[PDB]
Structure formats: structure tokens, C-alpha cells
């Protein structure tokens, strides 16, 4: 949008896709997460959905101070010697539809879905029939694995984005802060 | 005049297991007696490893005997073979010692590439290396892990003091034996990763701990002589040097880079390699193994 970002994770043993560089692409988002920061755009400019990966750099769509000085959170941190470093820049200046990040995608509605199924004062016997298990179906949501408390390696993910505007503009927040339908850098 | 049908080589520079325990950050002068870490369950049952709330840094320990005669295999069946291999390492040894080796194996031991998935999330680590002739240290060290590079390999009058000594021991000038601690900065209550049992995790004392092999995997990414690239960093000294992580290989047996075909022209052929691929050759000779037909 106003200023476009960067993260490249640099090839090695530790950031394999198995689960030290798997489950580091869709959970590890703690500048929009944990280390400080909530109002940006997610665009990953790596979205190839022929890998089921929807990026491939730290893709990342700020305004122009949020890019060049505003984006020092803790969410950025390993690429220091296991990767390589990025930096800010400026926003799309042509149209590019890269309206698609990581956001808040996705279908793992199982992980607690019981009280929509049989816990609704009835038995176990409808966890299927009443609620069924429709949205608790993985998919190939293009997006990084998570190392949250669901297993010791990476997990699932997706992108929640769409189409990207043709402007220079931080799109809509989402979960992740996906910045769908904003004019981010198309890759 | 060819190579025995058994080639058993005794390895060198042999880990041990290495003890967690977790431990505030500058308390390092009294970090002699910590609590442990223990592995319990979450749920769906699962076994994950996490600090006492309280602290902040993981505190990992093993020890390190560097053990030297890296010429001799330990079974070999045929002695003209066997002969003409020491006579190759002694032509390698004279013209060069174990110094370029052991500044690369220095290396390992410092920026603490055995913290595997402990060091990447990290923003303090400090390694303490001491060497112990006795009981007592008669030798200490101190080394940063951060301000020494993960990928790229410089040198120290520090590490180039330490390198002597590894490269005292590999020649086998004397005894060396080293206790590697280090202090990890990783947060309160936060997930340590303990090496991960075929899904259990591995503790001794009921302490979570990480296996011997899977340090000494970490102590030898010194192979920068690749067939393909060094833009990607170290890899682990492998014959058919090949990742799991990144799936692919190096070194092909259709390449002549390949350590049998390099052993073959360096020993039998009498088919030097360079220099910077003879550090390779020797380098598979301290890891051993089954060799020969």
C-alpha cells in the first residue's frame, strides 16, 4: 500500500520444511500477534499455491513510516543469522492486486465444534448429523505451518486475502490484518 | 592396492548428552545447582518441555573428549591398505596440521549451533567452554553466540587459542577434555526443544535432554566445500553429503567430488584433490564408520 516490506529466510538445516522452518510461516506473525503491532496490511509476495505455501518472503504491506522506521517489532527476529535481512521501501506505484497475506483463512472448525454438533443439551450422537464436521475439513489453504499448542512441529494454515485494490492504500483488518481489497505490492 | 572389504574407523571428538535446566539470567555466578526440566503433558495427550515460569534461561551442559589417531582405522583387512592410509594422513599431517580443521570445529563449540531450535528465537546466548586437565579447570573460556556468526566463519585469538587445543588433541600431543555451558536468554516459561523420541522426549533423570549424535551432528557443519554453492552456509562433513531438511543432496557419485571417489584418487589412485577438499576427506575420518566393500 504506502510502504511494502520484505523478510528473507535464508536456506539451512534449522529452516527446513519439516518443523524449525515449516511451522514458522503462518503462526510466527507476532508483530501482528505478540511483539507489538495490530493495524497493518498482510501481503505475502510469494503467493504460489502450486506448493500450498501462499508466500515465500516475509511479505509485509505498511505505510511509509510504519515501513521505514514503524516496523521494528519483535516479529521479525532469526532472519539476524539463521536468514537474511530486509527493509522498507516504498508502496505499490502501479496496480497490483496483492490483496492476499496471511489472515484469518481457514477451516479447523473441529478443534471445538462438539458444542455446535452434540453439546447443545443433547448426547454425542449428533456430531455429525446436527452440526456436521464441514468446517473442521483441511484444505489447501496456501499458507505456513503454526507452533502453537496443537503438536510439537508446524500445523495448518491459510491465506485470508483476495483481490488487491490498484491504488497505494492498507486494505481491510482481518485476523492476521490481511490486507484484502488495498492496492499492497503483487509480489 | 584396492580397499579392504572392512573399513571400521573409530570415531573422534565424542559428545555426551546434554542436561536441561532453566535458571535466572545473571545469576550465572552461583548456576552450579539449578532445577532440571521435566516433561510433562498438555491436552491429545502430548509431552511438551517448558521452563519454570519463574526463569528466563536455559542452561544447556554436556562434555566433549577430543580423542586424536584419526589415521588408524580400528578393523581393516588387508595390511598394505591399511599401511598406505596412514601413510596418506602422515603426508596430510606433515604438510599440514589439524589447525584449519579445528578452527572450523572452534567455531561450533562458540555461536552454539548445538542449541538446534533453542538458539533461533533467542536474543542472549553465552557459551562457557573450560578445559579440565583434573577435576579442577585448568583452562576457561567465555564466548558470545550471537556476535559470532551462524553462517559465515570468522577468526579469534580467543577461538584460535581454543583451536590449538582441539587441534592438540586430533594429533594426539595429549589429553583434552572440555565442558561446553551454555546460558540461553529464551523468556519466562517459554518451549525449550528437547530432541524428540520415536512420542515421548528424551530424559535421563527424569530431565529433558538432548542426544548424544545430534550434538555432534551440530559439531561438524564445517563442509563449506561444496560441489553446487556456499550461499546457503555450512552443512554437516557427510559422505554423500546430503540434508533432510532441504531433501536434495550435494556431492553425487556422478561428480567426482564424491569422499569414496576423493578416497580412491587420494589414497589408491595417488590423485591429490585441493587442499580445501582435503580438509573434507579427513573430516569423514573423525566422524568414522563402516567404509570399504
Given at each position: 500500500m504506502d510502504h511494502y516490506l520484505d523478510i528473507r529466510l535464508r536456506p539451512d538445516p534449522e529452516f527446513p520444511p519439516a518443523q524449525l522452518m515449516s511451522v514458522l510461516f503462518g503462526k510466527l506473525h507476532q508483530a501482528l500477534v505478540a511483539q507489538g503491532g495490530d493495524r497493518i496490511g498482510v501481503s505475502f509476495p510469494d503467493l504460489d499455491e502450486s506448493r500450498s505455501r501462499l508466500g515465500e518472503r516475509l511479505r509485509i504491506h505498511a505505510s511509509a513510516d510504519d515501513l521505514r522506521?514503524?516496523?521494528?517489532?519483535?516479529?521479525?527476529?532469526?532472519?539476524?543469522?539463521h536468514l537474511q535481512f530486509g527493509e522498507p521501501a516504498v508502496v505499490p506505484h502501479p496496480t497490483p492486486y496483492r490483496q492476499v497475506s496471511r489472515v484469518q483463512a481457514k477451516s479447523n472448525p473441529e478443534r471445538l465444534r462438539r458444542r455446535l454438533m452434540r453439546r447443545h443439551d443433547l448426547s454425542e450422537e449428533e456430531a455429525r448429523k446436527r452440526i456436521p464436521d464441514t468446517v473442521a475439513r483441511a484444505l489447501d489453504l496456501p499458507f505456513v505451518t503454526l507452533r502453537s499448542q496443537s503438536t510439537g512441529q508446524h500445523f495448518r494454515l491459510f491465506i485470508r486475502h483476495g483481490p488487491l485494490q490498484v491504488t497505494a492504500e492498507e486494505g481491510g483488518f482481518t485476523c492476521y490484518g490481511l490486507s484484502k481489497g488495498g492496492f499492497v505490492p503483487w509480489f | 592396492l584396492s580397499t579392504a572389504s572392512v573399513l571400521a574407523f573409530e570415531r573422534k571428538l565424542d559428545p555426551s548428552d546434554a542436561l536441561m535446566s532453566a535458571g535466572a539470567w545473571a545469576q550465572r555466578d552461583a548456576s552450579q545447582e539449578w532445577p532440571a526440566v521435566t516433561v510433562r503433558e498438555k491436552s491429545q495427550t502430548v509431552d511438551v518441555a517448558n521452563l519454570p515460569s519463574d526463569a528466563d534461561t536455559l542452561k544447556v551442559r554436556f562434555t566433549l573428549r577430543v580423542l586424536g589417531?584419526?589415521?588408524?582405522?580400528?578393523?581393516?583387512?588387508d595390511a598394505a591398505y591399511r599401511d598406505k592410509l596412514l601413510q596418506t594422513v602422515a603426508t596430510y599431517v606433515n604438510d599440514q596440521g589439524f589447525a584449519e580443521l579445528a578452527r572450523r570445529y572452534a567455531h561450533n563449540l562458540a555461536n552454539a549451533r548445538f542449541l538446534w531450535r533453542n538458539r533461533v528465537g533467542a536474543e542472549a546466548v553465552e557459551v562457557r567452554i573450560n578445559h579440565i586437565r583434573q577435576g579442577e579447570v585448568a583452562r576457561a573460556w567465555r564466548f558470545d553466540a550471537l556476535a559470532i556468526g551462524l553462517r559465515d566463519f570468522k577468526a579469534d585469538a580467543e577461538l584460535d587459542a581454543l583451536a590449538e587445543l582441539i587441534a592438540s588433541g586430533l594429533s594426539g600431543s595429549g589429553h583434552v577434555l572440555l565442558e561446553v555451558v551454555a546460558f540461553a536468554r529464551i523468556g519466562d516459561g517459554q518451549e525449550v526443544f528437547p530432541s524428540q523420541e520415536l512420542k515421548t522426549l528424551y530424559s535421563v533423570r527424569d530431565a529433558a535432554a538432548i542426544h548424544s549424535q545430534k550434538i555432534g551432528n551440530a559439531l561438524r557443519?564445517?563442509?563449506?566445500?561444496?560441489?553446487?554453492?556456499?550461499?546457503?552456509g555450512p552443512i554437516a562433513v557427510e559422505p554423500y553429503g546430503s540434508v533432510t531438511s532441504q531433501g536434495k543432496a550435494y556431492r553425487q557419485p556422478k561428480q567426482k567430488l564424491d569422499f569414496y571417489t576423493l578416497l580412491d584418487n587420494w589414497v589408491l589412485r595417488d590423485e591429490a584433490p585441493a587442499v580445501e577438499q582435503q580438509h573434507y576427506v579427513i573430516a569423514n575420518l573423525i566422524r568414522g564408520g563402516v567404509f570399504g566393500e
Open positions: 522506521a514503524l516496523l521494528a517489532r519483535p516479529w521479525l527476529e532469526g532472519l539476524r543469522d | 589417531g584419526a589415521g588408524t582405522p580400528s578393523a581393516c583387512n557443519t564445517i563442509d563449506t566445500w561444496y560441489p553446487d554453492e556456499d550461499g546457503l
